[PDB]
Symmetry: D2
Subunit: 414 residues, 4 copies
């Protein structure tokens, strides 16, 4: 039984693909594999009041199908909160509510997802030219192999730590913050260092300040103070489908310009509200004569080591061009991610994937990897397309249209 399409991973990207498949009149068979036990979207960073980067209209389907049964608006209506949400006049749901939306949409889906199923390899299919691919899957029970004419790789971002720092009991990546924080004894988090200059860093510093009034927090950033995220309407435009075209068709010079002029837009920077709240918190602490927030500007974390009951963080000060140690209970590295890369999953198939001038994968406008005539199946990428498609590649700004374009491409070439 050869599936038209297998989806590797079930985050919001492949969820939008599943929705696009259902909504499409095309008769496509599919299966989706997710390593985790259920849908799990950045749960380590589901802080109270944390807000979505994108508006509720940039959901799973609305920009493609404005009357989708999977829209955020349909969700709110079924939950009996559409009116209440509307009265709030806020375009941005909390990340918590958005997670509930994902789970609701997954349930509404006709076709069931296979969980506890980690894809370990993608292998060529019998036949030459290769007409299909073989997907190896591991369940807690056994292993199994499935076959597909096309595959959609959407395995998400990979956590990035500072060079020379490794995660441990006392050194956490921001992606795991709440997982560790949960049932940690408070007495044991009297002092926390948070490295990074972006949204997750600021959110965590603010959560710590608000959660425990005794915790001392060192915010270690390369900039001289948090830099604001650009959320103005012309900025929001670079994440429109039309801007994907402009970036895709654009010269290397133009592509460089996108990243140069517009890199201050989401995760590497911080929302105006979060910044103001932090500054307010610092100010009121000063009035009260009880300072707690230490903003360590123009600095980087270059090492961490557990010494007795202390996590000794080595900090490099750019101003002074010297490094020095800071003892804390826990170091949190809100230091971002590396992009998705299909390379390693693809193993031998990789060799048939055409590369570009800088050694990166070529990809067509419809998110299809460029291949040699030795390979005839579709390997589509949701994520990993920063070089070809631009800044929207790992975000939730364009789920409806990217998933629709991929389904349309599959129907087309079938």
């Amino acid at each position: 039984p050869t599936h038209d399409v297998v989806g590797v991973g079930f985050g919001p990207a492949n969820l939008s693909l599943a929705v696009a498949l259902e909504e499409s009149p095309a008769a496509l068979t599919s299966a989706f594999f997710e390593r985790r036990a259920s849908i799990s979207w950045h749960q380590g960073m589901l802080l109270p009041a944390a807000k979505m980067q994108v508006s509720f209209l940039k959901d799973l389907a609305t920009f493609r199908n404005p009357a989708s049964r999977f829209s955020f608006v349909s969700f709110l209506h079924e939950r009996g909160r559409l009116v209440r949400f509307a009265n709030n006049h806020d375009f941005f749901p909390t990340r918590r509510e958005f997670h509930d939306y994902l789970e609701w949409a997954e349930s509404k889906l006709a076709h069931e997802v296979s969980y506890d199923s980690e894809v370990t390899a993608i292998r060529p299919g019998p036949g030459r030219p290769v007409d299909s691919v073989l997907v190896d899957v591991s369940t807690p029970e056994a292993t199994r192999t499935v076959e597909a004419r096309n595959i959609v790789i959407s395995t998400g971002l990979v956590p990035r730590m500072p060079a020379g720092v490794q995660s441990d009991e006392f050194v956490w990546h921001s992606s795991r913050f709440l997982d560790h924080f949960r049932d940690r004894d408070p007495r044991s988090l009297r002092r926390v260092a948070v490295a990074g200059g972006g949204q997750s860093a600021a959110e965590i510093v603010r959560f710590l300040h608000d959660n425990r009034p005794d915790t001392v927090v060192h915010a270690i950033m390369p900039s001289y103070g948090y830099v604001v995220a650009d959320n103005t309407p012309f900025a929001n435009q670079i994440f429109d489908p039309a801007a994907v075209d402009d970036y895709f068709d654009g010269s290397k010079q133009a592509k460089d310009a996108f990243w140069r002029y517009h890199r201050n837009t989401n995760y590497s920077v911080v929302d105006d509200e979060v910044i103001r709240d932090l500054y307010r918190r610092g100010y009121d602490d000063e009035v009260a004569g009880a300072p707690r927030l230490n903003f360590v500007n123009l600095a980087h974390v270059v090492g961490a080591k557990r010494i007795a009951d202390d996590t000794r963080v080595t900090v490099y000060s750019m101003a002074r061009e010297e490094s020095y140690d800071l003892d804390v209970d826990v170091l949190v590295c809100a230091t971002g991610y590396d992009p998705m890369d299909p390379g390693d999953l693809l193993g031998e198939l990789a060799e048939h994937c055409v590369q570009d001038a800088e050694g990166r994968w070529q990809v067509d406008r419809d998110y299809r990897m460029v291949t040699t005539p030795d390979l005839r199946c579709g390997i589509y990428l949701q994520g990993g397309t920063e070089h070809t498609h631009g800044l929207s590649s790992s975000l939730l700004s364009n789920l409806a249209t990217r998933s629709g374009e991929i389904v349309s491409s599959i129907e087309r070439r079938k």
Copy 2:
């Protein structure tokens, strides 16, 4: 040819009824009569920057059917502006765009509306019990009569002038501001008085200031300065279906409390943005040493007379309990409206309509007038229900659910 329902008027209210009829699986036959040549929604006040009082989610259908083909979102999508609108992060469309939305929705409607058709009378049908009503319609050509099992009266608000003032060549009601303004020698309006303290008053003053740099404007209001409109979430709530229930089921004391505590919500007051813009305009003019905006506080217009080339406005000052004259070119009365009166059209049909203690029509929760048992036809009111259903009666805050409830009532009794 006896219709299931006839709608009198085709403003947004009956437009939402038509949509509710189409979306309902019930086989109801209908006809709508509009006296104007085409849909025409407060066109005299379609000023350049003017904004809707309600959010785009409070459209024709979405609160009832979140996947309606008639939603504002579906409209934006067909117009190719959904993404552009979403990036703006504004819940409130301009009144101009909303008018386009109404026209778009009217076109998308399967059933055609009868325009240039003024309903002149409604009268009791043939027989006992009275199972239908006869609706007399004047068209440019000839009059005719139509029969219906149910009627929905939605003829809108009636312009109200200050006691002692009549509309003329130089005395306008705000509802006809742009109609008159477009037709004038532009250098003919160097001095304008605008009476009223509410949204239309402030919008017109602001438009005049912005429109030419030399116009002198007298804003005459009973308050000491414009009072702000309450647009907070707890206030938007009174305009929700659930709050219609609370008002409807509520004692006379409770109903009085709604109007007392929450009268400062929309048209009698002024949105924060407009107020700040006007104040800013006044301030900058003062810096420039060129004052143009005269705010006449705690005052009322009590008469108007044309003397030669001047409209002589008689203004009563509350502060000093005396009146004085002010010479201008035009006086605009942004002095609001009287509610819809279903008594207008009913004539002999009232006989069968039950009044209350104080002589106001009794109306059921489903917007159906309470009738003597000889009358079996449904007379439904969209508007005119201020006493029974509350502040939402003449607004666009609840179109989807009111229209749905009326359609459901009609089907139920069928």
Copy 3:
């Protein structure tokens, strides 16, 4: 030793008077008596993050003397926070910082205040016409009498409870909220009722929600939801000195209009930020399926009794026209105040104070009580002038100019 002027009370009003005295070149001798042990400005409501109702420019002196050494700006500069404050771009200090400002200003004052000095009576001095008053002062030590040519009464508002409700161990007025709350067991207060519809009510509900995650709060208000405070620029104008003139010189009709149109300005209503925060809190609780905030609309507290381990609050529902009981741990009445009563401290002297035809004290523009020629002393009121001077009477919106007026009047008559 006969003083030119004696100040009764030392809140912000008499503090601004002390400053006006020091800045004036006139050689006036003064003494101020404060019952408390030190300056104490609404300390029971000094909640975290609570904000001033007035901007930092409406301080003790700036509107009179823009280069005062007692300005809020001079305070910030001496504290080394002027730049930090300026970068925040917020016109409204926290009430906690404002309290620090009052203490700083009091210290900078050359002339020392007599604390622990309760004024118990004001009596006619010797001789005719009466050229001085006698001020009876109780200290913990003894009692004494001081003599003065003029007196300024600024004793502040008086806590008002709902009719039929007395303050007790478990029934608090909002003015003492933090005083009681600090001396209480965190898990003693799992259920709290807060009566009132104004700023203090909403702030307290917010504080409770934020301070413990398990507390259940019943917000009992006469309106259908919190009503927003008007803080637009035309609204702030009614608190300008120029608007005091308009109100003072205005007919009764006019004065009525001020209170009618502009009652929605400060303490009886709730600032937009606090309202949105509460609504957001309620919404997120609903998402989490853990409701804690119970908004009891259209209702009044009409009685309270202690029964075993509970406080039984009798609530009247306007909608249902019935009353019912609500068991809580503590009832907080954020039910406002009655105005300062100049007559309180006045005995025989009242007989020489002229009333109007509704029985209210006549007061000149310069805040001087109108007296028969039998009395030549100045009795000035800071507070208690709601009928004569208007809405600004008990606020901090006009401290600089009211105090300056009073000092100028005193010098003029000397």
Copy 4:
């Protein structure tokens, strides 16, 4: 007659120096020379509604002397607008009001400024070591030479045009926009190109759109849409005196970091309000089906030639790496400035001034150029210190402390 200090130029920088001199108890003699007939601060960009980049507290003196008679607050008070300004709750004056403030402050100044006095050279005084300098001053009338122990050069920024583009009748630099615009028939500019991506560019495009309804405008910018200015509190901090210290004492790496992370602060970027207004304008035009604003993204103006009745603007598109000609009435280059350069006026004295590695002038913390022992005169720079003192060098964010520092340095050395 040898002055203690001579100021070259009389913009806001030397204006703050004059104030600092007057407020200082030190007996310093001074003279200021301005080439224009009167104070003239960016008058070509005094557009309607244009706002200051810095708050009113960042005025001539307040951060140094919070009770200065030259503060923006004292100005407002003398103008009878302090209360009116305060009620507006806006930290940012219009540029027009700020200009009035400068004029007011200049008038209040005891010592009169020499206008129509262009400084043409600064030369060594007699003797060695060099204890004075001679300032050559050209007037319309004559020339003369004055002698000074110290000089402060504050001659402002120098307009910069795109490479290969010269200003002409139809090619304007933004600094002269209103000067040209006002000398044109109102109907003479129906088509306009505006090059640049920063504040002045956006302000001009907005002004044009708002000023006539027919004007077509091409906004040509290197970015993909306007980029927002960071005006958050941590950002405003780099402009405080404490941050000048951090930048001054900082390594080259740290200084580079300031410019790298925080270049997006003022003139190179666009404020939130302006951006949203433009996007709104574009959206409403689209709804109206009358597009006028053409945003040309990822593009540079590379040439301009007059051809008959047109200006043929040559635009380079980075996207497609092709050029095309855009015919219009006028090209406005809002392309910024080059910094102040003291070498200009210095000539022979330069040999006594010490340069660094990259050939830049060395400058002490107190803004004094570093000199050899042969030169004992103070040459102070207000402007031209971007390399040594950082981003605040050419702004008005630090007038009070920079001027005070310079005066203190002069007194110290005396």
